[PDB]
Write a protein that binds this ligand. Structure first.
Ligand SMILES: NC(=O)C1=CN([C@@H]2O[C@H](COP(=O)(O)OP(=O)(O)OC[C@H]3O[C@@H](n4cnc5c(N)ncnc54)[C@H](O)[C@@H]3O)[C@@H](O)[C@H]2O)C=CC1
Ligand SMILES: NC(=O)C1=CN([C@@H]2O[C@H](COP(=O)(O)OP(=O)(O)OC[C@H]3O[C@@H](n4cnc5c(N)ncnc54)[C@H](O)[C@@H]3O)[C@@H](O)[C@H]2O)C=CC1
Ligand SMILES: [Mg+2]
Lengths: 298, 298
């Protein structure tokens, strides 16, 4: 069967290019796709594309993902995180195609301790969350063969990521400051991509799995504890670090235009039992990307 | 369920560490595994390990893979490519576990033009092939819940590979010589790993899929044409190359201790229809590993 992937160059998209390749005949698009429209600024054009190809499955990894900039341009975000999602949803539903789509925990507020469930009420704390909410609701109302994967703290080894930015700091600096009161599970693009591939093959066989899912690596940590592991990992690999002092700091002390939740924890029991898949502890995925970065035959 | 992977540090193994992680609880071993035996020099010890854990699925990516050295030490190869495969097979069969195992086209002779099929007769041209034959036959006779994936020209982006070795040459040299009369499909460790993960999930549900499979990327090329693509890819990415002259050369003109087949072509229709998976053209996988190597955020 035919699979159409939008957002092929993103973190998750680049991993989907790999994961979806054996599952069906993959057509991978992004914004610059010359010979096919992959620019979510043209909701009608991504519809046309979806009519032009007729896919059995659409995997959407494109989005407006700069949360802070979104506050300054809620319009463009709306277009990318909702308008084009509806346009692709309705078109998907013209042909009975499945639509796979990623969302975010920014759809919930904040209240430490408890992991959010799919049955929990939503009240988006910032713009990103809002437009993405509009996006999943739109998918929900226009295209019943869907899989929405709500995720959080996504990283990949290709391209910039938290680990790397922190490592640049740790090379160039002696003391460093990082949030220790935001809680979640760093989730690999590898894990996302692979789970998607399997979930597609179930859904084709069991249409009842359609719906909304929480999808993250297991466990929970904070940015400061995440950074500590990265530091330690790098010390263990022989990366010399200028860094001598690592201090934990509250969220508030340093500005971000759009608010971040203190509680990005997500319960993923729904996904685990509906797909019979395992979601490994967050550390595995991070240590693996760190090794790949450190043992770079080159 | 529990998955046990031997050969976790190899090309295919490193990709299996990722691909198998959502499929079940993964225990990943290699030779140096301190707290568990993963050294195929101790066939009884890998048996013990397999009894110590009781897996539902065993994925074996460990092997003696230095074909030329094998001619000088057919004994050690036998141990790694057959003896330990039988020991793990018989133990697998004590508990009804599935055994997944990789083999090679070196199991066939040579006769250009036609792709080898699973129903074709085998006559191994070198030691590697022989011990690996002993390995699959042993698996075949001792453990009926098996999946043998015969593959060829395997590469990964981590660690040394043909692309890289060639690129080192192309940086340091002006003229280069490479075989143009050996035919096959370079097959990515990514493709291998992902197909394995899916094939496991079918086999658990449809035990009749058990058996021997040809598994390679589609198409066919030669080392010289493969190297040309790598050169071109790198020229397209801005890698400056000293290389000015690229000459095709026959196999014979330059020595290898163990013989290489002129015909590594493999027909993979069996795998495609039994698993309902797609096997993409070899170029995709190579261009992707090249991009990852070239766009190395670092
Ligand atoms: N990155 C994160 O922390 C998280 C991401 N997610 C979701 O996961 C999904 C993937 O995220 P990433 O891979 O991190 O995103 P990314 O930022 O790496 O990738 C963004 C993708 O959107 C594409 N894009 C940008 N503008 C576009 C336009 N005008 N038209 C079409 N495509 C355009 C980019 O080209 C790229 O392929 C998105 O749904 C995202 O909202 C969810 C939770 C957190
Ligand atoms: N590499 C290739 O061109 C091809 C490989 N294959 C098969 O694919 C499989 C994987 O190949 P690669 O990932 O390329 O292999 P590799 O050479 O990258 O990995 C070899 C693996 O065997 C392990 N190993 C070596 N000695 C061991 C010992 N004494 N005990 C336990 N493990 C030991 C290594 O530690 C490593 O994990 C093997 O079955 C191989 O024969 C098949 C066709 C071609
Ligand atoms: Mg990778």
């Amino acid at each position: 069967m035919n699979i159409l992937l939008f957002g092929k160059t993103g973190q998750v998209g680049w991993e989907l290019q790999r994961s979806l390749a054996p599952v069906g005949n993959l057509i991978a698009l992004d914004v610059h796709s010359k010979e096919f429209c992959g620019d979510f600024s043209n909701p009608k054009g991504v519809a046309e594309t979806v009519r032009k190809l007729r896919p059995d499955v659409i995997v959407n990894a494109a989005a407006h993902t700069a949360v802070d900039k979104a506050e300054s341009e809620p319009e463009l975000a709306q277009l990318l995180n909702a308008t084009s999602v509806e346009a692709i949803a309705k078109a998907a539903n013209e042909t009975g195609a499945w639509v796979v789509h990623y969302s975010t925990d920014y759809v919930f507020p904040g209240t430490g301790d408890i992991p959010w469930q799919e049955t929990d009420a939503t009240s988006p704390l910032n713009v990103y969350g809002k437009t993405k909410l509009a996006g999943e609701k739109a998918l929900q109302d226009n295209c019943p063969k869907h899989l929405i994967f709500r995720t959080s703290w996504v990283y990949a080894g290709k391209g910039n990521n938290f680990a790397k930015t922190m490592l640049r700091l740790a090379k160039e600096r002696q003391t460093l400051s990082v949030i220790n009161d935001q809680y979640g599970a760093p989730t690999g693009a590898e894990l996302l991509a692979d789970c998607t591939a399997h979930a597609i093959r179930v859904a084709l066989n069991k249409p009842e799995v359609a719906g909304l899912y929480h999808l993250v690596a297991g466990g929970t940590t904070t940015w400061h504890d995440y950074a500590a592991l990265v530091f330690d990992e790098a010390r263990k690999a022989g990366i010399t670090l200028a860094l001598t002092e690592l201090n934990a700091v509250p969220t508030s002390a340093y500005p971000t235009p759009a608010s971040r939740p203190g509680n990005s924890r997500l319960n993923t029991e729904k996904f685990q039992r509906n797909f019979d898949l395992i979601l490994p502890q967050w550390e595995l995925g991070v240590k693996r990307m760190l090794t790949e970065m450190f043992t770079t035959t080159t």
